[PDB]
Design an enzyme around this catalytic site. Structure first.
Site, mmCIF file in Angstrom:
data_model
loop_
_atom_site.group_PDB
_atom_site.id
_atom_site.type_symbol
_atom_site.label_atom_id
_atom_site.label_comp_id
_atom_site.label_asym_id
_atom_site.label_seq_id
_atom_site.Cartn_x
_atom_site.Cartn_y
_atom_site.Cartn_z
ATOM 1 N N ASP A 6 12.421 -59.257 24.108
ATOM 2 C CA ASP A 6 10.611 -59.148 24.951
ATOM 3 C C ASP A 6 10.516 -57.730 24.281
ATOM 4 O OD1 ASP A 6 10.461 -60.433 27.419
ATOM 5 O OD2 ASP A 6 12.539 -59.890 27.722
ATOM 6 N N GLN A 7 11.228 -56.520 23.510
ATOM 7 C CA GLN A 7 10.429 -55.354 23.249
ATOM 8 C C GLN A 7 9.873 -56.584 21.432
ATOM 9 O OE1 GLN A 7 11.733 -53.852 19.623
ATOM 10 N NE2 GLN A 7 10.427 -52.291 19.528
ATOM 11 N N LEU B 136 12.842 -55.232 30.366
ATOM 12 C CA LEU B 136 12.912 -55.892 29.634
ATOM 13 C C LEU B 136 14.203 -55.777 28.385
ATOM 14 C CD1 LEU B 136 9.503 -54.951 28.128
ATOM 15 C CD2 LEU B 136 9.884 -56.232 29.751
ATOM 16 N N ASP B 137 13.941 -56.583 28.073
ATOM 17 C CA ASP B 137 14.914 -57.094 26.963
ATOM 18 C C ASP B 137 14.839 -56.620 25.613
ATOM 19 O OD1 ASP B 137 14.657 -59.333 27.928
ATOM 20 O OD2 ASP B 137 16.172 -60.630 26.613
ATOM 21 N N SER B 138 15.399 -57.432 24.130
ATOM 22 C CA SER B 138 15.585 -57.181 23.103
ATOM 23 C C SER B 138 14.016 -57.870 22.807
ATOM 24 C CB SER B 138 16.652 -57.441 22.526
ATOM 25 O OG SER B 138 17.904 -56.413 22.651
#
Ligand SMILES: CCCCCCCCCCCCCCCCCC(=O)OC[C@H](COP(=O)([O-])OCC(O)COP(=O)([O-])OC[C@@H](COC(=O)CCCCCCCCCCCCCCCCC)OC(=O)CCCCCCCCCCCCCCCCC)OC(=O)CCCCCCCCCCCCCCCCC
Ligand SMILES: CCCCCCCCCCCCCCCCCC(=O)OC[C@H](COP(=O)([O-])OCC[N+](C)(C)C)OC(=O)CCCCCCCCCCCCCCCCC
Ligand SMILES: CCCCCCCCCCCCCCCCCC(=O)OC[C@H](COP(=O)([O-])OCC[N+](C)(C)C)OC(=O)CCCCCCCCCCCCCCCCC
Ligand SMILES: CCCCCCCCCCCCCCCCCC(=O)OC[C@H](COP(=O)(O)OCCN)OC(=O)CCCCCCCCCCCCCCCCC
Ligand code: SF4
Ligand code: SF4
Ligand code: SF4
Lengths: 112, 76, 94, 115, 114, 155, 176, 207
Positions: free
Chosen positions: B40-41, B36-38
């Site tokens: 998504d976090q 995941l990327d930012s």
């Protein structure tokens, strides 16, 4: 005493001479904290003293407005309040300092 | 209830479709494990805010990269 | 203009004015719709001599602004204070 | 029966005109036509939201004053009594007290709308 | 290279503002779909929100990021207060626009535009 | 004969509709001033049965009197859609007709017929109040030509 | 000089205080206002009977456009394109070429009457009085396309309206 | 004595020159240039940092008293590295005079909001932000004011095309107004009008 100043929201001052002496005196004290050679101090002391001399010399409110040549006496009091506010702000701004930055080469060249 | 806190947190992860439940563990790193990327976090953190009901200011959230780190943060 | 005497009196009384003298509908007092032809005057530059355009060329007399200060004693105001207005002798109070 | 016939006829004719109005014209219904009106832009929030009443105190007073007229309406009949001394006193007593309450609410600023 | 900042001194402060705006938009999509009575789903709205953030993912100038966040917030205030109408909200989806080809040959057949 | 009856009934409903045209109180710019002059005493549109009413629910005609911007376009469509039928649109002036003198503007709709169907186009910038009154009478004669019940009969 | 619109001190004598009491209770100033609308009821109204009666116009009126001819029937327009250049709305479109004889004449002359602002700059700019705004203001149409005039429509307008147009120019050309 | 030529007023020119340097003497930290036009208008060119000090001084000073903000606007000059020029037009009722104060900024540099000095500036600054993209810091409520909701771009920039990038129409399939790429049935015709002969020698620039 006048019934009205004629300007909405500007109330008639009971004691205009006393109010003008207090405000000009406050302005002069605030000016005493500006550097001596600052042009704002020199010019503002000059004009403030001139108005203060008129306030002392002329006891008649109608005649005083004729000398000060700045509208109703209540307009003069408001203006003195504005100047006093400006003087306080000028101390923190310090616009007597040298130019902060020259503009780019031809910023003010018109036509291009 | 630290045991249950893990139970509820992992419940949220299983729904977040981009997170495959097959490869998830309480110590997986959202970036280098689930891919995941930012943002998504950010979505994952917002899910835990809903499920538990208290704000997670951005200063705190940008450290929570593993499910355990969320579990530990929830305790505090 | 065609109103009868009684109606003229009734509407004059109702409004408090003499309406007939200042009727709001126009009749024969207005100008004819056919007028004699004009013969309009000419301006001052219509001369056959002493009329060189360079001596009456307003655009070419406009100059670039005068630089007072470039970043390269008595106090003043932008203008003298405005003289106080006077009450109308025509009708000071409406 | 006359009165009930008159009432039935009045509201029947009104109902008949509504029925004609709804079944005679050609209809063309779609979503945008029947949406609520608010000068061309979509309404902000529901029209069922609370609407402040600034005359709430006058409205409650209207209740108490509306019952006074019920107490004062019988006065034309009360004037037929032989005991005219008592009725006149009590008739005037009621009205004065109604006037007193209006004066009290007026002076206390009950008639001015809240801000 | 010394310039006056807008809001963020550096890119780490700017990204904090970007993350905050993304949360506000993410929370808002369910309400926008409800208030405006859109026929798209909440996932579609949130996917569109994500798409708009990713078209700018390559910025490295905090002042440029500060402005995009500033514009993004005005954009959000228009939506929440329903200053926008359904037409403005749906302009993000280009429903009536036909798909323009991206390959060479399709462009070649239709006309001269590169 | 059904043909004779429906022919007469069209005359009745057509006469009622053209004799009682109620324009929406709707104006956009300059041209709304000439529309006000058509209501004024010299022309007195009301003497034709033409009465302004504010509510779209109670209106038969939208006179688009002035420039339509992109910002105003959804609102104009909203109030047109909220008119009950039959409804007619009169486009008044160059701006509403085809964009006029702001035709090449980024914020201007190039003709209100991109947004609503238009029955009559009244030219001018602005059309004189009398030119608009001519346009309204032209709409009345258009309504007088409607053959709704004759067409229904032959369906 | 200035004047005060509302700076009055009302009289406090008994007569003046009672005159105001009667006004408040008897609505005298409201009755005075009824008299004024009553007086208009009995005036002749200003309505004219359009289309049987028409509002007055002058020779300068700017209405529908027309392309004019010389008395011989030759077109006045020489395709100079001054009207096209000055048109504030860019409503005029012109193409031209040598006619079959040597004449300089237009092959296209369009006016988008839905771009036009009826300003009259084109007839001011024309050096030969070819393009004019005529006196006609009753040409509303049922379709937009009917307001995109080509050269045939404008020449027909001139042939249709020349009798009135020439008389209007005759009345006004000494002011131009 | 020249019927067609506008008369000069050298008294007003003298007075404005004296006041112009009076302002330069009091505010040297900010004032970069002072000029007076041949039709007698005074312009003060300042560093953008001095917008609040300079405007506050002109409003409040007893020899200024420019109590009215007549107009506040921007000019776009793409050839300058600071392409936007911010122009304040002020009026002093007490002295029956006007003054123009000018500063500059680019697309990324914020200008301080002058709402604290003139409440009139609130909408003028929203218009500048709307039509030019200049950001005003500490504005109480900065948002578009003239362009359509969600409109993209700043139309008064010189590089923004006259007809924009999108146009509107009503689409029956979606039952709403839609925005689509702009196509013109008749392209606006660009005219080349400038004559190749110099008109005003007084303004010639060195080669
Ligand atoms: C129920 C009530 C209705 C029933 C009663 C009907 C009354 C008769 C109506 C006749 C009016 C037409 C008169 C006429 O010959 O036409 C002139 C006209 C030609 O005359 P003109 O030269 O053009 O102008 C006349 C005057 O110079 C210009 O006009 P004018 O302003 O000078 O007035 C002229 C005349 C016009 O009036 C009449 O002749 C009839 C008066 C009836 C008064 C009823 C109230 O009035 C008078 O001469 C003054 C006395 C009239 C009584 C005034 C009372 C005012 C009210 C009191 C003031 C306070 C009010 C609160 O010919 C027509 O156009 C005929 C058209 C038909 C009009 C309708 C008449 C029938 C009305 C309906 C009948 C019942 C159904
Ligand atoms: C229910 C009973 C109501 C019947 C009213 C019939 C209206 C009569 C009428 O049409 O007026 C004359 C009208 C007058 O014609 P007009 O409306 O075209 O007149 C135009 C306006 N002027 C005259 C001022 C230029 O006659 C008709 O238009 C023919 C329609 C007849 C209506 C059908 C009857 C069946
Ligand atoms: C104060 C009381 C006053 C009450 C007044 C009551 C009205 C008195 C006047 C009645 C005149 C006759 C009414 C006919 C009006 C019918 C409405 C209409 O035009 O619909 C057209 C329609 C058109 O039908 P259509 O089938 O041809 O087309 C409509 C369908 N679409 C929308 C798809 C095109 O015709 C009818 O509905 C039937 C007409 C029969 C006439 C009876
Ligand atoms: C011997 C013992 C005898 C005892 C009895 C003796 C008593 C006699 C005298 C009593 C007084 C008589 C008048 C009483 C009627 C009510 C008067 C009144 O209240 O009017 C004042 C009212 C207040 O308005 P305002 O001036 O703004 O406020 C006052 C201070 N707050 O202002 C208004 O109400 C104005 C209303 C505005 C709307 C008016 C619109 C219509 C105007 C035209 C109506 C003409 C009347 C025709 C009546 C038809 C009759 C059927
Ligand atoms: S058509 Fe002319 S008068 Fe009408 S709104 Fe447009 S510019 Fe104004
Ligand atoms: S009247 Fe004006 S806008 Fe119309 S064609 Fe002539 S110059 Fe162009
Ligand atoms: S109409 Fe007149 S101005 Fe226009 S091209 Fe022809 S001659 Fe030239």
């Amino acid at each position: 005493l006048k019934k009205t100043t004629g300007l909405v929201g500007l109330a008639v001052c009971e004691t205009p001479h006393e109010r003008l002496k207090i405000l000009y005196t406050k302005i002069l004290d605030v000016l005493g904290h500006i550097p001596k050679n600052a042009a704002y101090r020199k010019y503002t002391e000059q004009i403030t003293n001139e108005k203060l001399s008129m306030v002392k010399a002329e006891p008649d409110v109608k005649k005083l407005e004729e000398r000060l040549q700045g509208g109703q006496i209540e307009e003069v009091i408001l203006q003195a309040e504005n100047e006093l506010s400006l003087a306080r702000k000028m101390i923190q701004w310090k616009p007597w300092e040298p130019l902060v930055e020259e503009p780019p080469a031809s910023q003010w060249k018109w036509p291009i | 209830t630290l045991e249950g806190i893990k139970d509820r947190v992992l419940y949220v992860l299983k729904l977040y479709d981009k997170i495959d439940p097959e490869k998830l563990s309480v110590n997986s790193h959202f970036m280098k494990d689930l891919g995941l990327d930012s943002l998504d976090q950010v979505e994952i953190i917002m899910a835990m805010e809903d499920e538990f009901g208290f704000e997670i200011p951005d200063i705190d959230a940008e450290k929570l990269m593993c499910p355990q780190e969320i579990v530990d943060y929830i305790a505090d | 203009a065609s109103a009868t005497r009684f109606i003229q009196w009734l509407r004059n009384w109702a409004s408090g004015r003499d309406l007939q003298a200042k009727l709001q509908l126009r009749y024969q007092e207005i100008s004819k719709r056919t007028q004699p032809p004009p013969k309009l005057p000419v301006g001052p530059s219509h001369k056959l001599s002493n009329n060189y355009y360079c001596t009456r060329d307003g655009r070419r007399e406009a100059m670039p602004p005068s630089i007072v200060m470039s970043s390269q004693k008595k106090a003043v105001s932008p203008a003298p204070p405005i003289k106080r207005w006077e009450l109308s002798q025509d009708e000071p109070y409406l | 029966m006359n009165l009930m016939l008159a009432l039935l006829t009045n509201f029947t004719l009104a109902t008949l005109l509504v029925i004609i109005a709804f079944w005679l014209p050609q209809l063309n219904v779609y979503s945008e036509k029947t949406s609520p009106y608010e000068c061309g832009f979509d309404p902000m929030g529901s029209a069922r939201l609370p609407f402040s009443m600034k005359f709430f105190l006058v409205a409650i007073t209207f209740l108490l004053f509306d019952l006074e007229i019920a107490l004062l309406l019988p006065l034309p009949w009360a004037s037929q009594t032989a005991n005219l001394n008592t009725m006149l006193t009590m008739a005037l007593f009621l009205i004065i007290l109604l006037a007193v309450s209006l004066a009290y609410e007026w002076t206390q600023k009950g008639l001015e709308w809240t801000e | 290279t010394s310039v006056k900042p807008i809001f963020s001194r550096d890119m780490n402060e700017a990204k904090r503002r970007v993350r905050e705006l993304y949360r506000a938009w993410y929370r808002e999509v369910p309400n926008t779909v409800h208030l405006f009575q859109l026929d798209i789903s909440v996932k579609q709205g949130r996917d569109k929100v994500r798409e708009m953030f990713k078209k700018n993912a390559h910025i490295t100038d905090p002042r440029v990021v500060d402005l995009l966040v500033i514009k993004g917030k005005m954009e959000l205030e228009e939506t929440i207060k329903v200053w926008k109408q359904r037409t403005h909200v749906m302009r993000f989806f280009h429903e009536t626009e036909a798909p323009r080809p991206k390959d060479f040959l399709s462009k070649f057949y239709v006309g001269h535009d590169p | 004969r059904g043909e004779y009856v429906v022919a007469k009934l069209d005359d009745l409903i057509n006469w009622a509709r053209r004799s009682s045209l109620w324009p929406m109180t709707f104006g956009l710019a300059c041209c709304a001033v000439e529309m006000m002059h058509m209501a004024a005493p010299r022309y007195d549109m009301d003497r034709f049965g033409v009465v302004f009413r504010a509510s779209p629910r109670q209106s038969d005609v939208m006179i688009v009197a002035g420039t339509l911007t992109n910002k105003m376009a959804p609102a104009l469509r909203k109030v047109y859609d909220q008119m009950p039928e039959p409804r007619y649109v009169v486009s008044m002036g160059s701006c509403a007709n085809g964009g006029g003198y702001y035709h090449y503007s980024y914020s201007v709709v190039r003709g209100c017929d991109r947004i609503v169907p238009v029955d009559i186009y009244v030219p001018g910038c602005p059309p004189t109040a009398e030119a608009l009154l001519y346009g309204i009478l032209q709409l009345q004669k258009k309504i007088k030509r409607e053959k709704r019940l004759r067409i229904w009969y032959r369906r | 000089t200035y004047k005060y619109v509302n700076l009055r001190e009302p009289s406090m004598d008994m007569k003046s205080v009672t005159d105001r009491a009667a006004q408040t209770l008897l609505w005298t100033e409201l009755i005075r206002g009824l008299g004024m609308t009553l007086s208009y009821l009995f005036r002749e109204p200003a309505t004219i009977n359009y289309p049987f009666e028409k509002g007055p116009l002058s020779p300068r009126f700017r209405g529908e456009h027309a392309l004019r001819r010389y008395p011989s029937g030759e077109e006045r327009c020489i395709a100079c394109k001054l009207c096209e250049a000055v048109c504030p709305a860019q409503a005029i479109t012109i193409e031209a070429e040598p006619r079959a004889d040597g004449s300089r004449r237009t092959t296209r002359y369009d006016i988008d009457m839905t771009k036009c602002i009826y300003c009259g700059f084109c007839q001011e700019a024309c050096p030969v009085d070819a393009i004019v705004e005529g006196p006609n203001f009753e040409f509303s149409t049922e379709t937009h396309e009917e307001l995109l005039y080509n050269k045939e429509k404008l020449l027909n307008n001139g042939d249709k309206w020349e009798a009135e147009i020439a008389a209007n120019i005759q009345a006004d050309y000494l002011y131009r | 004595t020249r019927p067609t030529v506008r008369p000069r007023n050298d008294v007003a020119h003298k007075q404005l020159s004296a006041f112009g340097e009076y302002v330069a003497e009091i505010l040297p930290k900010y004032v970069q240039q002072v000029q007076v036009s041949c039709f007698n208008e005074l312009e003060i060119c300042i560093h953008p940092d001095g917008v609040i000090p300079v405007l506050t001084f002109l409003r409040d000073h007893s020899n200024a008293q420019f109590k009215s903000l007549a107009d506040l606007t921007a000019v776009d000059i793409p050839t300058r590295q600071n392409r936007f020029e911010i122009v304040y037009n002020l009026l002093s009722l007490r002295f029956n005079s006007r003054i123009r104060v000018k500063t500059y900024t680019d697309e990324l540099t914020p200008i301080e909001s002058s709402v604290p000095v003139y409440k009139a500036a609130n909408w003028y600054e929203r218009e500048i932000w709307d039509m030019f993209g200049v950001f005003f810091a500490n504005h109480p409520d900065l948002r578009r004011i003239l362009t359509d909701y969600g409109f993209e771009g700043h139309p008064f920039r010189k590089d923004f095309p006259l007809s924009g990038y999108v146009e509107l129409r009503y689409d029956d399939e979606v039952k709403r107004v839609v925005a689509e790429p702009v196509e013109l049935a008749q392209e606006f015709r660009k005219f080349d009008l400038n004559s190749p002969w110099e008109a005003f020698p007084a303004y010639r620039q060195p080669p």
